[PDB]
Amino acid sequence: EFGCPDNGMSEEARQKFLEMHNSLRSSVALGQAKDGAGGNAPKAAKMKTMAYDCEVEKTAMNNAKQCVFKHSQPNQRKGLGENIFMSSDSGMDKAKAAEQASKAWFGELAEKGVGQNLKLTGGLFSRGVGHYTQMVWQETVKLGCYVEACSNMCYVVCQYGPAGNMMGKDIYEKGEPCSKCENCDKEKGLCSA
């Protein structure tokens, strides 16, 4: 057991980010997530559980602390994906900001629609679903985030190991939950491995 530094991020917010991500991955994997394209998102055969990673939080922090709403360049988050969010309520409670960011990102599926073809095409991305697709990217298994109270915004950055949103690849493998998983969390339809 290895805690992250006393660096301004609260344990409550870290827990909220990780639980919300795994919860929503699980909803998608079990076939329970509404898709704006119609029906629900397809069931996932091997959606992996995420773990919190303090090193990934560190690089998310490096972005958040600059208090500019902007994606980081790849060499500032080597090997990692990234979702960013902001609210004008600067002093928002950090676990509340975690909840709002995770909802805004995930909400792309219901609002914009993805559909049954999970290949990440130019056309698909242009629908504005790239924050959702990173949250539920099958192979992404490390999460680390930071919430910064900047002068004029509450700025949230999460980063994701390995990076998702690889052009032309599938967001996840379709099939019955855990059907391609030998280490299955049967309750949630999530794979450790």
Side-chain angles (χ1 to χ4, degrees), residues 2-193:
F2 191 86
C4 304
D6 187 14
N7 64 9
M9 186 56 177
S10 64
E11 201 60 25
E12 293 78 13
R14 296 184 171 114
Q15 291 181 342
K16 185 64 174 172
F17 273 120
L18 185 66
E19 292 174 9
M20 295 250 345
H21 277 74
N22 282 324
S23 176
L24 292 168
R25 289 167 71 88
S26 166
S27 78
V28 167
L30 292 174
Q32 298 182 348
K34 191 62 180 69
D35 185 335
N40 289 1
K43 298 173 180 180
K46 58 183 296 184
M47 179 70 74
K48 306 196 168 170
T49 302
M50 291 173 161
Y52 204 80
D53 178 323
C54 303
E55 291 296 294
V56 180
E57 174 177 290
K58 174 188 180 55
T59 43
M61 183 181 69
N62 290 347
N63 181 339
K65 287 286 198 195
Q66 303 172 55
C67 284
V68 182
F69 186 73
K70 195 191 180 46
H71 276 107
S72 55
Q73 285 275 109
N75 197 232
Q76 285 161 87
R77 50 163 155 131
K78 291 176 259 82
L80 301 171
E82 182 178 72
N83 278 333
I84 62 178
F85 168 86
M86 61 176 280
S87 167
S88 69
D89 189 352
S90 278
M92 181 169 295
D93 168 89
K94 299 194 182 95
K96 178 178 170 193
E99 186 176 1
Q100 294 204 348
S102 300
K103 291 173 159 178
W105 296 331
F106 187 84
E108 292 179 346
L109 171 63
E111 189 190 351
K112 306 311 203 188
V114 167
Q116 299 307 286
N117 186 348
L118 303 182
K119 191 181 184 281
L120 189 63
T121 59
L124 178 57
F125 201 88
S126 70
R127 283 195 98 174
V129 291
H131 303 103
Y132 164 77
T133 57
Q134 177 62 269
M135 282 184 77
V136 303
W137 197 262
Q138 165 183 299
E139 295 293 329
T140 289
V141 297
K142 297 175 161 286
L143 178 67
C145 311
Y146 196 89
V147 180
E148 180 69 353
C150 300
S151 297
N152 286 5
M153 63 176 167
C154 173
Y155 180 39
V156 175
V157 178
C158 283
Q159 287 170 3
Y160 291 92
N165 289 358
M166 296 195 310
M167 183 176 71
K169 307 293 180 77
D170 284 353
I171 301 153
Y172 54 87
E173 177 171 346
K174 296 187 284 174
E176 285 299 327
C178 282
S179 58
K180 301 281 229 73
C181 179
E182 91 179 36
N183 298 312
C184 172
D185 184 339
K186 284 303 200 172
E187 298 292 308
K188 308 153 187 92
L190 295 178
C191 209
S192 344

